[PDB]
Design a protein around this nucleic acid. Structure first.
Lengths: 102, 132, 52, 227, 74
RNA sequence: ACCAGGAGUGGAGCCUGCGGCUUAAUUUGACUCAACACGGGAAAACUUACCAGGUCGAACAUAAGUGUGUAAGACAGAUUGAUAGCUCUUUCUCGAAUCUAUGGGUGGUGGUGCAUGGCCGUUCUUAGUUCGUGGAGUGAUUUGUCUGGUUAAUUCCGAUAACGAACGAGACUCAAAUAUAUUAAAUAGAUAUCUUCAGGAUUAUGGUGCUGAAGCUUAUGUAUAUGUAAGUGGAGCCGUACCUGUUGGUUUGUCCCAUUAUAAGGACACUAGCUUCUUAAAUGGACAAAUUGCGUCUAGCAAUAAUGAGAUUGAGCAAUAACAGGUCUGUGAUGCCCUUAGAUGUCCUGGGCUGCACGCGCGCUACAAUGAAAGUAUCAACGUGUAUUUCCUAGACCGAGAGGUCCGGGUAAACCGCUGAACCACUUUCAUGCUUGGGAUUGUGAACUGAAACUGUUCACGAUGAACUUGGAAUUCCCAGUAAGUGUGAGUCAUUAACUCGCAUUGAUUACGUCCCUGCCCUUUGUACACACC
């Protein structure tokens, strides 16, 4: 009868993750979407390391490359006609929303 | 069991299925080098069944005792071929059929309070053995 | 049909360098296929700020 | 389309899509002064926010060149005809953004080593565009076979710390010449604090700006009515 | 959890020590909290000091944290 | 850089790297620091650039067959390495891009890094550079950019000979310690009780106890277990609670409901599981008048103060001027040079890049009782894992093994996985004896991955046990979770680490200095030094 819709949020900027809890959850608990707070995911840090010189002739140094990906989880207990407006607004650069229908 | 440490608590229980006729001896108990690391055979069979004491805490804390999750992580402390030492998988063999030696799935139907508690009743007697 | 051997779906040949088509210096496996010296040029803006 | 792909393979799949795009965005749109592309993802479509300078030559006659964008990447990336949307925007303060200035100096070299005619005028233009610090550097074979460098500088270029990874904006350029090649590289320094600064970061690198001590009337005689 | 066959057991020294204080800090008595510290703190073997000394990352050009390997006919 | 050491290599065998050797070729770039398990250079083919055989063709205006077949394809026997109708003995054929000698562009891992772009390397672990405005000089050039004190410092007082300067340094960005005091979990769970997984008699025993309990076998049925009696035997039996343990939900708890079942709506504890915890998304965070017979009133160490905090502490970052450093073989970066139906291009079949009297470097297991074995106990962390590619593997099962079969999980806080890593801890076998130390060495089969394994793709067994007993002169590395011992992940990867990056574990000795040593920084002074003491 009543639906539970878990909505994960992934991005790279933690500020954009601070920007999606800035306005999505506040425009939903006015109508009580049962957010269960900002559910933090552990980050998926990506390390690559490479040499610097093409044609590696001399002083064999290296060069480390880092990448930080972060999520935060918003689960909701509401039917699908409720959450349709929240998918439209608010939108954010670099952030991704994953809600499946079927 | 979570009593005193299972050095000798393994050692007594190895005698008891050997006592009770439930040996269920592998016919190559004097052949196998119990894994791809040993230069010599084991001294005897008295380890081969004895890891019921290990699963009594691993059915308790790790998993239902699947044989692939079993043989991997215990009994690997090896030096393999000389460039350099590495890890092993120990490749058990017949103790896949040591469930028959006891007579989503569960691995023992008597290690809940039935025959594990006998070993507890052995170690409660071993409290009285260690009473002097 | 003819004179083209090498059933290329085994070995390094030929899963080679979908960013520069250069063989002998390849980063193959991260889902990149980048020819790591070209990854120097195109480190950005495919993330990958250095930190430490 | 959609895949069961991993998230870390998903996130780098955007970047190999991104880092390919700005390559040939400089192959074609170097004639219009291409500067940058934003690509966002909303539900049921994606958007491509190109920024360039010659924004009347990016559209062409009867909307041909805009469909030329959409016919390209949907032929390239095989994605949905309609979910890809490309919009070209005007680069605000083309001199200040200055990577199009790096692109246009390749159109300046054909004045016969036009340093005082054109190339030094770029360093004049960057103060005519009103930046803070600037630095260009050209190397190659000049008046002889031998390689040799110039570094016309003006201002303050930090090179270090964290804000060098934010403040200064470099963009190297190559060009073919009959001799063989002159490498073009420019380092600019931009006052990211004061002017309008809609979304840069609104920074503050090292400065200690002090508020006035705000003198008081220490006495404060009562002079109080009873309304 | 974690640690090792030496180190993880050393954290248990911090485990027993702080529990007696906190149960005495709030529940039993101020001086009961006092009388378990003074007899301890004479040398105490840092039974409550959690030193943050963890391992130090590597460097390229070496095998280890700070050592390296050299003499390429220097 | 020593010193006080510690570990080392240089000795030994082996893997490689470079040479030299040779060869059809053993393709090559790189030669003091700043070439040498480098070129991410862990190669059967591919790579591949080299060597043999082959093979392919690519543009146009001209032009001459006309369309009486200009073509293009196979059989067939030759040529083959394979059917290359590439060629062809003889055959039919889609015929037209008029298949051109002719424009000449095209490719190139072909040449020059001493013609270049780019990046990178070292100069230099540094603390060092510059500019306007003055006085200094005819000028090169100085001054600012210093005497001293101090600093990691061109960092600061301070002489203050422009400064307000400017780059560098610092500042800044990234990492466990930090009140969960705030909201934060399909991670963990703390808990709590509901439980279920229940021994002790540790408990209280009610019934029971020598009367046959407990325990035991025989018979067959049921598809061997079980039932019972007999068999059998002489004290216990059986239930509960307390003590110690699985489990499931304990999400706005219970009982409600709507619902197939969550919630509130209905009340109760009014909290019949909350956030310690891992995770942050924050701000806290030695946040230093911290007192100290004041050093040029300022940067008087003191260890003293905290009691998450005596830096939680390493990295990245890096200026001016430069080098004929390295890279044309990373690139559609490129001048120029060279070549192009007869290729250096290109695809095929091979070969090689691995070959060896020898030299040299990085590095692996040793040379053993602190040890080699057997056992037992039983602690990680960084990570990684399959939808246009064969990944992670759970489970059963089979096989000395190697592996193989059958069936899952998993696009990943959720599954592999609580990855329950190694060395070490604990009893034994050993009894120092090139031994059981040490596993090179050669046979043999069994295997795996793949079209293909042959100074080998690797892997299993039972043989084979050499050198090797702490390594000469020389010589490297490094100061706290560090050195070293000890694993593991990732990187390349059809299979191949024996190397390189990261990760954790075990955890020391010694210095807390100085300028003999090789050092390095614009202070003074010397010169007959240009390309600067080679």
């Amino acid at each position: 009868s009543v639906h539970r819709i878990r909505i994960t949020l992934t991005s790279r900027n933690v500020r954009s993750l601070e920007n999606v809890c800035r306005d999505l959850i506040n425009g939903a608990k006015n109508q009580n979407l049962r957010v269960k707070g900002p559910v933090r995911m552990p980050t998926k840090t990506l390390r690559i390391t490479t040499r610097k010189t093409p044609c590696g002739e001399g002083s064999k140094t290296w060069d480390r490359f880092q990448m930080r990906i972060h999520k935060r989880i918003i689960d909701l207990h509401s039917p699908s006609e409720i959450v349709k407006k929240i998918t439209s607004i608010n939108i954010e650069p670099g952030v991704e929303v994953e809600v499946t229908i079927a | 069991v979570k009593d005193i440490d299972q050095h000798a608590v393994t050692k007594a229980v190895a005698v008891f299925l050997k006592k009770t006729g439930k040996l269920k001896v592998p016919d190559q108990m004097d052949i196998v080098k119990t894994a791809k690391f040993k230069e010599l055979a084991p001294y005897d069979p008295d380890w081969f069944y004895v890891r019921c004491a290990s699963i009594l805490r691993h059915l308790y804390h790790r998993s239902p005792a699947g044989v692939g999750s079993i043989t991997k992580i215990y009994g690997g402390r090896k030096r393999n071929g000389v460039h350099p030492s590495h890890f092993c998988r120990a490749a058990d063999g017949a103790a896949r059929k040591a469930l028959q030696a006891l007579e989503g799935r569960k691995l023992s139907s008597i290690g809940q309070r039935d025959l594990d508690r006998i070993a507890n009743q052995i170690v409660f007697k071993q409290r009285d053995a260690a009473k002097q | 049909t003819l004179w083209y051997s090498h059933p290329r779906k085994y070995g390094q040949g030929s899963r080679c360098c979908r960013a520069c088509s250069n063989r002998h210096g390849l980063i193959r496996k991260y889902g990149l296929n980048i020819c790591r010296q070209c990854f120097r040029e195109y480190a950005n803006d495919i993330g990958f700020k250095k930190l430490d | 389309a959609n895949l069961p792909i991993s998230k870390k393979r998903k996130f780098v799949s955007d970047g190999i899509f991104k880092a390919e795009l700005n390559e040939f965005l400089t192959r074609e749109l170097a004639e219009d002064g291409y500067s940058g592309v934003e690509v966002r993802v909303t539900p049921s479509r994606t958007e491509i926010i190109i920024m360039a300078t010659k924004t009347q030559q990016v559209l062409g006659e009867k909307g041909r060149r805009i469909r030329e964008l959409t016919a390209m990447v949907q032929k390239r990336f095989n994605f949905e005809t309609g979910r890809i949307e490309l919009y070209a925007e005007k680069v605000a303060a083309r001199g200040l953004c200055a990577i199009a200035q790096a692109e246009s100096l390749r159109y300046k070299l054909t004045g016969g080593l036009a340093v005082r005619r054109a190339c030094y005028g770029v360093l004049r233009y960057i103060m005519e565009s009103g930046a803070k610090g600037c630095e260009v550097v050209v190397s190659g074979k000049l008046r002889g076979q031998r390689a040799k460098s110039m570094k016309f500088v003006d201002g303050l270029m930090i090179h270090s710390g964290d804000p060098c990874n934010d403040y200064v904006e470099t963009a190297t350029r190559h060009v073919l010449l009959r001799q063989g090649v002159l490498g073009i590289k420019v380092k600019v320094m931009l006052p990211y604090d004061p002017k309008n600064k809609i979304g840069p970061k609104k920074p503050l690198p090292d400065n200690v700006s002090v508020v006035e001590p705000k003198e008081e009337k220490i006495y404060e005689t009562p002079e109080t009515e009873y309304k | 959890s974690g640690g090792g066959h030496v180190a993880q057991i050393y954290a248990i020294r911090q485990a027993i020590s702080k529990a007696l204080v906190a149960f005495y800090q709030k529940y039993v008595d101020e001086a009961s909290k006092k009388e378990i510290k003074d007899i301890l703190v004479q040398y105490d073997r840092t039974l409550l000091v959690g030193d943050p000394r963890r391992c130090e990352p590597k460097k390229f050009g070496g095998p280890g944290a700070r050592a390296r390997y050299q003499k390429s006919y220097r």
